[PDB]
Design a protein around this ligand. Structure first.
Ligand code: FAD
Ligand code: FAD
Ligand code: JKG
Lengths: 588, 588
């Protein structure tokens, strides 16, 4: 019953006050703790819907059933007079700071989930340490605090995506009446990297400050869990030492893989390097077909580069494959070339990168197709986006006993708990969860509230919406069409779909029938919406609101009875009617 | 119950077949009707939850209980042998064209709702006429088929808005690395208007083609209803004649109002003239405070014009007022001048418009502030945006019986029926309804299904989302905050809000804390979202999807459990936490 909740909370919380709102004796303790700069969690029992039962089990720890009761790391401290006695005797500081370990929580990894978990834990009185270290790339690139998204991920690529998009606005401008001469317009790579890097730098520093003003200790060190409560750390000056913590959170994420071919590590780069590269890549070869590969090929072509993408098999594996093909067809018609069904064999250096003059090198790529024929072409730059992976042998001593799945990711319960009872993992290294930054932040926030504040909310990991930021963006929430058919049978699946054309595209003389959307619906369940898909401008802003409706179990009927906002792209979802089974064309 | 439905359906349907999806006799009649180009509604009894009692109740009209049964305008026509016999003998075409009236449906008004009702009715075999005539403005402006939105509303105004937004792309371009000199670039009004008008012309054409292909009769004539079934039509040649119909749908919309001051009609213009003006307005005074006024002042400013808005009292009366003031503040910080608490007293002409050199005139405007001080200034163009009104005197003879509310709008039941049992009204003139194109369209399609296909679905007019396309856009769904407090009391209303900054605005050096959103919730009803508000870019794309969740009863918890898409603006709705009562700052 309620009893096992209360004991979990009391054993885990660092400082926690069971209080009531209309209690002037409770206010006296809150104010004293606030003046002493003592942060704590608070459980207002008159607001929880079974506070009476809780007030009874409290007596199992404190032998009293009144309010307030203050606890520190599992130990009952006093009622109002006892804490007030400690305070006027100068004994309150040394009691709240009494712990078996150096910290209440050590977070290994200062990325999206790590930093989120750390700040949230500190709010409730947990002495917290956050460790972060950025191991350099093969050519030596390195960056500041924040993790992959901040430094070499979502933030720089979308800013470069946006620089690409601005090229369309210079194309459109004559049709809308602006007199600029588009043919004498060049883009400057290094100017744009400076502005992107400058915003990035403002985020590293913002994070360092945030940690400081939350009383979190930031340690720029490499962590290693040598035992369930012991984390070993290495300085930037090689200096080694050991710190201890009650709870450990692992949040060290992933890094880009390289194919095992001669020349790859020596002569190629990855996305870790692309966002601070000091020279324009030049004629580029992007090898791979994930969203990283397609997004990066996309904005290089838009900034005027000569870009080729080498695809082993298909585009965007695991995504709706009608949509992936539409995405890829847009790119192929708007200046991205593809070497389909082709694979690399080696990279040969012909020219070394010129640091002085700020120029790329020259490379020779040898590959072959699946018919056997040979690929041979020279490129100034070669980017590998062939997947990402964790390296938990650098982080996690095998003797500690954290169970890893077959890819190297951490097996966790639905509350992020590992096979060692005090160790948890969040974000990209949590086996089988969506690898996305908002997921890592919600995971790490919600988990901090459970350990140190007595919350019960779990992170919900299903139907998390995504957006691929290719030249024509692709937004999705829910099942792909092939997955929905394979799960319920083709007779049980109805798909409503339609092309559309942004009103902005009419005067600009753009394509009529490339933008596309569809709803995938289960017949036998009130036409429930299993998955939404849209290819068009601003696809993230379009998709996001519908993720709420879908989390609430939206049906086709719900979409019909809601009225559109006009003129928008997104309103076309409110009047879909052509089914795929009908065979009627979806064009405009 | 069921009995009354079946008799309403049989009485107003034009041609209707009762059928079942398995019956191969019914398939025989469908094929004859198809081959004869006979359009008809079809009800498939085995797909309806009470097809048994319906099939029995059919015998009250036909004296048989079997399927298929074919009816024409209330009269039972036969089973399969009788239909086949009529076809075989050349009698079927005459039977199905038998009517007491010229038309099953006459639509007075060819705009958003009118066109939508007509096309839908035609699909089920209703012989349909739509009338549309555009009374010219005071200076002579006139336009083609489609209504106010297509020709002088949502379509031209968003295109002009979009031209204005393009100016920020060219400001933003230098910071993302593109070379162009923003200073040597200028805008050509007439080039822009040619592109807008070209798209509008292709909409005028598309609609005449759609009516032709649906066998709808289109008469470019002004309609007056003289009796319940008699519509008097007047030619572009002034020829008068009378046509009759079973059902009448009034869908005549509204036109701009003018203040009763000297010189307003002679020398001012309205939005009806703005979108096709052959010269650039020049220095402009917009008189009004509605969305029309603010959206037009907005794009005129972004296109380099010298723009002043003259406001009697407040901005955007009827919208959440905190949101309205953030809208006006933004416009004022970006080049729109405001003359506050001011009203105009007369317009004097200093220059006649120059048709020759294609230039505007010159005008002197006199007015006064609410404290008596005088207003006096020169402008080249004065645009009145002081409301809109219907002119049902020109459509509706007194003696017919159609009740009007005190505004001239038509009083209708929740199924759009007027005080005259066969006359209906949809769109802007339907009293008490949100005056929006998606609304007018949905009402027209749903009503046509009920008249001629046996449908029961009503149009749901509650919580229709909206977007105001000012320089910084404002999307909304549900109640204003002040309305929500007036209705439930302050203690029962919680408001979560935050500022935000688009990632696109970081490198562009745009403002940190100007974009804003809030959720207005009800504490006693599970923290139900009563109103959603967002000021920022793509606010209509942002808001639309959430309208579906609001319709389904979404709470604050529903927003919390959904994960955001990153990086987006709209993802801010998924982690809102600062409340207004807490007094914490909403900046970031
Ligand atoms: C090119 C690219 C684009 C992306 N775009 C998007 C997007 O648009 N939207 C989206 O939602 N997601 C996007 N992602 C994914 C997103 O970046 C990740 O899901 C997210 O960053 C994972 O966060 P995390 O907290 O799990 O780990 P990370 O953010 O990777 O942070 C882990 C941190 O811990 C550090 N660390 C590692 N080992 C140690 C150690 N032993 N000691 C100390 N510190 C250590 C790492 O160096 C790093 O700083 C993108 C990823 C890439 C590569
Ligand atoms: C400047 C402006 C901007 C707008 N922007 C938006 C927007 O962004 N989004 C939105 O949802 N709404 C917008 N609206 C509102 C939208 O235009 C109306 O809600 C919509 O047109 C209502 O459609 P309706 O069918 O009721 O009327 P209308 O579209 O006005 O159609 C009525 C038609 O009937 C004709 N008619 C009138 N009298 C007769 C007669 N006696 N005989 C025959 N024909 C006749 C009229 O000339 C007209 O063609 C805007 C309106 C304006 C003025
Ligand atoms: O809602 C909107 C709809 C279209 C646009 C302009 N289109 C930009 C693009 C051109 C090519 C790919 S994306 C802006 C907002």
């Amino acid at each position: 019953g309620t009893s096992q909740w209360l004991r979990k909370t009391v054993d885990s919380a660092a400082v926690i006050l069971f209080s009531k709102t209309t209690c002037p004796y409770c206010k006296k303790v809150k104010d004293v703790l606030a003046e002493a700069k003592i942060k704590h969690a608070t459980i207002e029992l008159d607001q929880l819907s079974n506070g009476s039962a809780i007030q009874k089990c409290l007596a199992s720890f404190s032998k009293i059933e009144t309010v307030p009761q203050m606890f520190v790391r599992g130990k009952f401290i006093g009622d109002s007079q006892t804490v007030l006695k400690y305070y006027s005797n100068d004994e309150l500081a040394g009691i709240v700071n009494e712990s078996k370990y150096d910290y209440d929580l050590i977070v290994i990894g200062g990325g999206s989930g790590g930093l989120a978990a750390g700040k949230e834990a500190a709010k409730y009185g947990a002495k917290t340490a956050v460790l972060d270290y950025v191991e350099p790339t093969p050519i030596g690139t390195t960056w500041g605090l924040g993790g992959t998204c901040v430094n070499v991920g979502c933030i720089p690529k979308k800013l470069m995506h946006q620089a690409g998009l601005l090229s369309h606005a210079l194309e459109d401008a004559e049709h809308f009446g602006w007199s600029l001469d588009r043919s004498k317009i060049s883009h400057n790579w290094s100017t744009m990297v400076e502005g992107v890097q400058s915003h990035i730098g403002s985020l590293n520093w913002g994070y360092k400050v945030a940690l400081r003003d939350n009383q979190v200790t930031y340690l720029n060190a490499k962590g290693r869990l040598i035992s369930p409560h012991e984390v070993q750390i290495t300085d930037k000056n090689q200096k080694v030492s050991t710190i201890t913590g009650n709870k450990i959170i692992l949040a060290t994420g992933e890094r880009p893989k390289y194919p095992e071919i001669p020349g790859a590590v020596e002569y190629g780069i990855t996305s870790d390097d692309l966002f601070s590269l000091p020279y324009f890549p030049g004629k580029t070869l992007v090898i791979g077909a994930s969203y990283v590969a397609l997004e990066c090929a996309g904005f290089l072509a838009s900034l005027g580069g000569d870009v080729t993408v080498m695809v082993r098999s298909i585009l965007l594996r695991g995504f709706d494959q009608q949509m992936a093909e539409k995405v890829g067809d847009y790119m192929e018609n708007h200046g991205v070339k593809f070497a389909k069904l082709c694979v690399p064999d080696e990279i040969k250096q012909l020219k070394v990168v010129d640091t002085e003059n700020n120029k790329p090198g020259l490379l020779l790529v040898k590959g072959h197709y699946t018919d056997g024929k040979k690929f041979e072409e020279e490129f100034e730059t070669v980017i590998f986006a062939v997947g990402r992976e964790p390296q938990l042998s650098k982080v996690l001593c095998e003797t500690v006993g954290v169970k890893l799945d077959k890819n190297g990711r951490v097996v966790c319960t639905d509350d992020e708990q590992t096979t060692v009872s005090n160790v948890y993992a969040i974000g990209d290294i949590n086996a089988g969860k969506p690898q996305l930054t908002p997921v890592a932040i919600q995971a790490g926030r919600y988990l901090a509230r459970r350990l140190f504040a007595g919350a019960t909310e779990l992170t919900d990991y299903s139907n998390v919406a995504t957006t691929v930021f290719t030249p024509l963006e692709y937004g999705a929430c829910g099942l792909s069409e092939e997955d929905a058919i394979e799960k319920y049978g083709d007779k049980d699946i109805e798909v409503y779909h339609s092309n559309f054309k942004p009103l902005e595209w009419t005067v600009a003389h753009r394509e009529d029938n490339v933008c596309y959307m569809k709803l995938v619906c289960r017949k036998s369940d009130n036409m429930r919406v299993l998955g939404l898909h849209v290819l068009g401008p601003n696809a993230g802003e379009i998709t996001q609101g519908y993720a709420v409706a879908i989390k609430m179990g939206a049906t086709k009927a719900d979409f019909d009875r809601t009225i559109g906002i006009h003129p928008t792209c997104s309103e076309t979802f409110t009047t879909l009617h052509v089914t795929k089974k009908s065979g009627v064309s979806p064009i405009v």
